[PDB]
Amino acid sequence: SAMEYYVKELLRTAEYAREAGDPEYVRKALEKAELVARIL
Amino acid sequence: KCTVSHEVADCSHLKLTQVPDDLPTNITVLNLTHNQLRRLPAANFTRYSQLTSLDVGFNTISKLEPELCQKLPMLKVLNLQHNELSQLSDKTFAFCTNLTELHLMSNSIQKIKNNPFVKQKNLITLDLSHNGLSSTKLGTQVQLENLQELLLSNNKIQALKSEELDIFANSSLKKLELSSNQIKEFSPGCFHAIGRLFGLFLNNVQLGPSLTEKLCLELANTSIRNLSLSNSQLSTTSNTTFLGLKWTNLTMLDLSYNNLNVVGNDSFAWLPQLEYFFLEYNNIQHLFSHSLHGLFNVRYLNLKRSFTKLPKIDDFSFQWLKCLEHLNMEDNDIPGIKSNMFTGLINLKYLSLSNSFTSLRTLTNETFVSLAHSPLHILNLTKNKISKIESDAFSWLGHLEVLDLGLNEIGQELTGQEWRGLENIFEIYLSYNKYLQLTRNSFALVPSLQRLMLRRVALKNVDSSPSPFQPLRNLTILDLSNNNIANINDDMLEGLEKLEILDLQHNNLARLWKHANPGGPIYFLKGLSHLHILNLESNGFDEIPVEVFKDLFELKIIDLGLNNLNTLPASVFNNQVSLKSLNLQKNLITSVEKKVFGPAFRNLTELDMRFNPFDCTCESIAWFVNWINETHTNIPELSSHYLCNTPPHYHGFPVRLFDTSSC
Ligand SMILES: *[C@@H]1O[C@H](CO)[C@@H](O[C@@H]2O[C@H](CO)[C@@H](O)[C@H](O)[C@H]2NC(C)=O)[C@H](O)[C@H]1NC(C)=O
Ligand SMILES: *[C@@H]1O[C@H](CO)[C@@H](O[C@@H]2O[C@H](CO)[C@@H](O)[C@H](O)[C@H]2NC(C)=O)[C@H](O)[C@H]1NC(C)=O
Ligand SMILES: *[C@@H]1O[C@H](CO)[C@@H](O[C@@H]2O[C@H](CO)[C@@H](O)[C@H](O)[C@H]2NC(C)=O)[C@H](O)[C@H]1NC(C)=O
Ligand SMILES: *[C@@H]1O[C@H](CO)[C@@H](O[C@@H]2O[C@H](CO)[C@@H](O)[C@H](O)[C@H]2NC(C)=O)[C@H](O)[C@H]1NC(C)=O
Ligand SMILES: *[C@@H]1O[C@H](CO)[C@@H](O)[C@H](O)[C@H]1NC(C)=O
Ligand SMILES: *[C@@H]1O[C@H](CO)[C@@H](O)[C@H](O)[C@H]1NC(C)=O
Numbered sequence: 001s002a003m004e005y006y007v008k009e010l011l012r013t014a015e016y017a018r019e020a021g022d023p024e025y026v027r028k029a030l031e032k033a034e035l036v037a038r039i040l
Numbered sequence: 041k042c043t044v045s046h047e048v049a050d051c052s053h054l055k056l057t058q059v060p061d062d063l064p065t066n067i068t069v070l071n072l073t074h075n076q077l078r079r080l081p082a083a084n085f086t087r088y089s090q091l092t093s094l095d096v097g098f099n100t101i102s103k104l105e106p107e108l109c110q111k112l113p114m115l116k117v118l119n120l121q122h123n124e125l126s127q128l129s130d131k132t133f134a135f136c137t138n139l140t141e142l143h144l145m146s147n148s149i150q151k152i153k154n155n156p157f158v159k160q161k162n163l164i165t166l167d168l169s170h171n172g173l174s175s176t177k178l179g180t181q182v183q184l185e186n187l188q189e190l191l192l193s194n195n196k197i198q199a200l201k202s203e204e205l206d207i208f209a210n211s212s213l214k215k216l217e218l219s220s221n222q223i224k225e226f227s228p229g230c231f232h233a234i235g236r237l238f239g240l241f242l243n244n245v246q247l248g249p250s251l252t253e254k255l256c257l258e259l260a261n262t263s264i265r266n267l268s269l270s271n272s273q274l275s276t277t278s279n280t281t282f283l284g285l286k287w288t289n290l291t292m293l294d295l296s297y298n299n300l301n302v303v304g305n306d307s308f309a310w311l312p313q314l315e316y317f318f319l320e321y322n323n324i325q326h327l328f329s330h331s332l333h334g335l336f337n338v339r340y341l342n343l344k345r346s347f348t349k350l351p352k353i354d355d356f357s358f359q360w361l362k363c364l365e366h367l368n369m370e371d372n373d374i375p376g377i378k379s380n381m382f383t384g385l386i387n388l389k390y391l392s393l394s395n396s397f398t399s400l401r402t403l404t405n406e407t408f409v410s411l412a413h414s415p416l417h418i419l420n421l422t423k424n425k426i427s428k429i430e431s432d433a434f435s436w437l438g439h440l441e442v443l444d445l446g447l448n449e450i451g452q453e454l455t456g457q458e459w460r461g462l463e464n465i466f467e468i469y470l471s472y473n474k475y476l477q478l479t480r481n482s483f484a485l486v487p488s489l490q491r492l493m494l495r496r497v498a499l500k501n502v503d504s505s506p507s508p509f510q511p512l513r514n515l516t517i518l519d520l521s522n523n524n525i526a527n528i529n530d531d532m533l534e535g536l537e538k539l540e541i542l543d544l545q546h547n548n549l550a551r552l553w554k555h556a557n558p559g560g561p562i563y564f565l566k567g568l569s570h571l572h573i574l575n576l577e578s579n580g581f582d583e584i585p586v587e588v589f590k591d592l593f594e595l596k597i598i599d600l601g602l603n604n605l606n607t608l609p610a611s612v613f614n615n616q617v618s619l620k621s622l623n624l625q626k627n628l629i630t631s632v633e634k635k636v637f638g639p640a641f642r643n644l645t646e647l648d649m650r651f652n653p654f655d656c657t658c659e660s661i662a663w664f665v666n667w668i669n670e671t672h673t674n675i676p677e678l679s680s681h682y683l684c685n686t687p688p689h690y691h692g693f694p695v696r697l698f699d700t701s702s703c
């Protein structure tokens with residue numbers, strides 16, 4: 001499955017956005033990654 | 041007093057003068073890591089008959105009587121940190137030989153006296169980090185026969201002598217710290233006296249020329265494997281430096297942050313056994329072909345910021361590194377790729393080009409020819425201000441797995457002539473691009489793709505063509521967000537049955553589910569049987585078709601959030617059974633019904649119906665309160681977020697505080 005690479009993808013996109021300046025999506029991605037980690 | 045989990049009395053920060061004297065006698069780790077003690081007598085310690093790991097660091101202790109070791113034969117590790125043991129005695133621990141580790145950091149010892157310890161039958165590790173020692177005369181006779189990891193981390197040492205190490209005649213040293221200590225002399229012969237000196241650390245010490253050559257000659261005929269020369273001022277390299285390191289079987293090196301300005305000529309050819317290589321963070325300005333002679337055993341290379349902001353990497357300066365596997369040419373001002381640049385690196389497996397080029401605005405066909413003979417698995421290529429991709433610039437890459445082309449300025453109109461080849465592609469990172477107009481045949485040459493990332497890419501021509509994603513059949517993640525897409529047909533997902541994640545987040549699809557649209561609402565969520573997460577958020581759907589979610593059976597999270605959506609039709613989640621979550625945050629939902637939201641709340645785990653202004657009446661929220669009475673679903677906080685807003689009769693109340701029996 002791609003769930004593990006999806007929880008990696010959200011983090012990497014979070015650093016990309018943080019370097020680009022999109023804090024709200026950074027927070028949403030962090031919360032979503034934590035929730036998916038719970039559900040996995 | 042102190043929290044005890046299983047066998048540790050973690051008294052973390054309890055400023056105290058005496059031992060607790062009330063914990064169970066079978067505790068071992070009396071972790072008093074700051075508790076401001078001043079004496080450790082052999083009377084209160086009697087009860088602690090099973091003490092194993094006494095850690096009293098960051099404390100003020102000035103004396104340790106030998107009686108303390110009378111009652112502690114089971115002690116394994118002691119850690120006296122930041123104490124005041126400047127004065128030491130011969131009998132402070134002489135018979136006390138059962139340790140498995142020892143630490144005396146920052147005890148401010150200026151002298152070793154005569155022989156503070158002479159048996160040391162089981163002392164694996166010994167640390168003297170920030171004391172101020174100016175020698176290594178830890179004894180007078182043969183000792184430390186079982187020591188492995190000695191740490192002279194930061195001292196006032198000045199040189200090294202053969203006589204002072206005679207105590208180490210038969211000691212097997214593994215990793216010897218001599219860092220952060222200005223050494224200005226090396227008397228003839230220091231390390232062949234030591235039986236098994238394996239490692240060596242000389243970081244943050246200014247050696248420079250006229251000292252490095254003498255050191256490498258001094259290391260001759262020794263069994264040293266690792267090495268460390270970080271931050272040592274080394275502006276150049278010549279064939280006379282590291283000359284004495286031809287007889288060493290050295291398997292590691294470290295020459296980073298030392299600002300290697302230039303590389304003269306055949307250097308390092310005296311290191312045929314070097315397996316690792318650290319030259320990151322250098323102020324290098326040139327690279328001759330004969331710069332890297334003889335490094336045919338290096339497996340890792342670290343050149344992240346060696347090439348400084350123009351360098352002229354000469355022709356065939358990489359052909360010698362025949363065994364390189366990891367390349368780290370990340371943050372440099374490399375001016376373009378010459379036709380004879382990366383020739384011969386047939387062992388390469390990781391490229392890491394990102395913020396390296398100031399010339400790669402476009403990618404022509406004759407730009408990646410250098411890597412034709414080199415296998416490649418990861419091609420980073422991020423934010424090198426790429427402007428446009430021309431035809432057949434990736435032909436030479438056949439074993440490639442990741443095309444991580446994000447944070448670029450790729451604005452053009454694709455046709456399919458840029459992925460010529462790439463039959464083994466597993467991932468393309470096309471996010472964060474200016475614009476990308478599509479055709480019906482843009483991705484026909486990549487049927488092996490598994491991860492199509494298309495976020496923050498103004499993606500036009502999505503519906504006019506039959507299906508831009510029709511050729512894609514092995515796609516699992518389809519990230520489509522922040523594109524302002526506002527017109528969709530039954531063409532997104534045709535034959536894409538193994539797609540698992542279908543984010544559509546900042547899209548203008550609100551107008552295409554309405555009931556006034558000719559031909560009925562567009563039912564595009566079709567043909568899906570393996571969709572896990574479907575983020576349909578922040579669009580503006582103030583309507584839901586009754587059968588809009590028919591195909592989704594094994595779906596887990598069906599997030600519809602940040603919309604103006606309300607009045608959920610009945611049986612909207614009738615067929616979804618394995619729906620392990622909902623989310624309808626920031627909507628206009630006011631009334632919950634046992635038919636509208638009953639079958640969906642069966643095997644649930646999370647809810648975020650956060651800020652919707654609930655109508656607060658005995659019929660609007662009754663099943664909801666009777667269901668939140670017993671929460672088998674781990675819902676997030678209910679405090680000051682679920683509020684009664686519509687009816688003034690009972691306005692301003694949390695949901696749980698509703699009276700069920702009244703109605
Ligand atoms: C390390 O050991 C080698 C021998 O394995 C030493 O080489 C000898 O060098 C001396 C003069 O320097 C010659 O007279 C011998 O004939 C050499 N022996 C050989 C080549 O087998 C080398 O000098 C040693 N390194 C030192 C002492 O720094
Ligand atoms: C190290 O490099 C230097 C170059 O700086 C070499 O010195 C040259 O050696 C050749 C061959 O013996 C002779 O023409 C001169 O001694 C030098 N020529 C020039 C132009 O400098 C040196 O031989 C190399 N090897 C060692 C061990 O020093
Ligand atoms: C890379 O692309 C250039 C540009 O098309 C190619 O150069 C052409 O090559 C053909 C074949 O010999 C000539 O007939 C043309 O006159 C060349 N110029 C142009 C503008 O087309 C070049 O051959 C390509 N290289 C490879 C390896 O495919
Ligand atoms: C391509 O290189 C970039 C830049 O080094 C990588 O992005 C880094 O990813 C790691 C892993 O999460 C982060 O800790 C770094 O902060 C990221 N760098 C930056 C500048 O944000 C990226 O991961 C590489 N591509 C792949 C496929 O690994
Ligand atoms: C150690 O003492 C505590 C205190 O009662 C006890 O709960 C624990 O079982 C003891 N453990 C052992 C190994 O004796
Ligand atoms: C002892 O306490 C220190 C200070 O917090 C901590 O770093 C260390 O991990 C602890 N050791 C244990 C719990 O074994």
Ligand SMILES: *[C@@H]1O[C@H](CO)[C@@H](O)[C@H](O)[C@H]1NC(C)=O
Binds near residue numbers: 114138
């Ligand atoms: C302590 O050291 C002595 C002397 O070497 C040895 O006989 C004894 O077994 C050791 N005990 C422990 C618990 O290490």
Ligand SMILES: *[C@@H]1O[C@H](CO)[C@@H](O)[C@H](O)[C@H]1NC(C)=O
Binds near residue numbers: 292
């Ligand atoms: C040399 O350093 C590497 C990397 O830290 C390590 O894996 C290796 O064990 C070290 N060599 C020795 C002899 O310990």
Ligand SMILES: *[C@@H]1O[C@H](CO)[C@@H](O)[C@H](O)[C@H]1NC(C)=O
Binds near residue numbers: 261262287
């Ligand atoms: C590496 O060279 C040194 C220098 O003579 C030698 O002592 C050592 O035995 C060599 N290593 C091996 C594995 O032979």
Ligand SMILES: *[C@@H]1O[C@H](CO)[C@@H](O)[C@H](O)[C@H]1NC(C)=O
Binds near residue numbers: 306329330331
């Ligand atoms: C090193 O010296 C050789 C001598 O034959 C020469 O050909 C080569 O260009 C030199 N490399 C430099 C100066 O970088």
